[PDB]
C-alpha cells in the first residue's frame, strides 16, 4: 500500500494496566507480553474496537489504550461471550471473568489452597511433589 511515516511521536517501551509493553511490534503481539492475554483474545479485543492491526503499536493513542482497558474488565457487555474467557462459571460467585496479569497467580494460588483445605488427592499430590522436588 502507501508508506506513511511520522516525525517522532512513537514510544519504544510503554506501560498499560501496570504491565510493560513495547511499541515496535504490532498491537496483538505487544499484548501477548502481558500474562493471561494471548494472541486470539487480543485479536478479538482489538478487532471489536475497530483498531487497524496492520499498523504497529508505537502509534497507539491514549484514547485507544483507555478503550482497550475499558474492554478488559467487562468484555461481556460488548459481544465477547462466555467461551473466550478464562474464569468461566466459577465456584465462588457463579459468573464469568477474564483474569488479568496480577490475578492469574491469585487464581492459581486460590485453586491450590482450595484443594488443600478440601484435602483432595490433586492438592496433596501437587504439594507433595513441590515439597519433594524442591528439597
Amino acid at each position: 500500500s502507501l508508506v506513511v511515516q511520522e516525525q517522532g511521536s512513537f514510544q519504544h517501551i510503554l506501560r498499560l494496566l501496570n504491565t510493560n509493553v513495547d511499541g515496535n511490534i504490532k498491537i496483538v503481539y505487544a499484548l501477548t507480553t502481558i500474562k493471561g492475554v494471548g494472541r486470539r483474545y487480543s485479536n478479538l479485543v482489538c478487532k471489536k474496537a475497530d483498531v487497524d492491526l496492520h499498523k504497529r503499536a508505537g502509534e497507539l493513542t491514549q484514547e485507544e489504550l483507555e478503550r482497550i482497558v475499558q474492554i478488559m474488565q467487562n468484555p461481556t457487555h460488548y459481544k465477547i461471550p462466555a467461551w473466550f474467557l478464562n474464569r468461566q462459571n466459577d465456584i465462588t460467585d457463579g459468573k464469568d471473568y477474564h483474569t488479568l496479569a496480577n490475578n492469574v497467580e491469585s487464581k492459581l494460588r486460590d485453586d491450590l489452597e482450595r484443594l488443600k483445605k478440601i484435602r483432595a488427592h490433586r492438592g496433596i499430590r501437587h504439594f507433595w511433589g513441590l515439597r519433594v522436588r524442591g528439597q
Binding site: 465456584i91 483445605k117 478440601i118 483432595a120 488427592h121 496433596i124 528439597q135
Partner: peptide, 26 residues
C-alpha cells in the same frame, strides 16, 4: 474418616481416598 464440609461440592468421593504410599527416592 472424612467429614463433609460445604466447599468440596462438584467432586468425586474417591479423590479423598488415596491408593498408594508415595515413591520415595531420597
Amino acid at each position: 474418616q472424612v467429614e463433609i464440609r460445604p466447599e468440596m461440592l462438584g467432586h468425586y468421593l474417591g479423590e479423598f481416598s488415596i491408593t498408594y504410599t508415595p515413591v520415595r527416592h531420597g
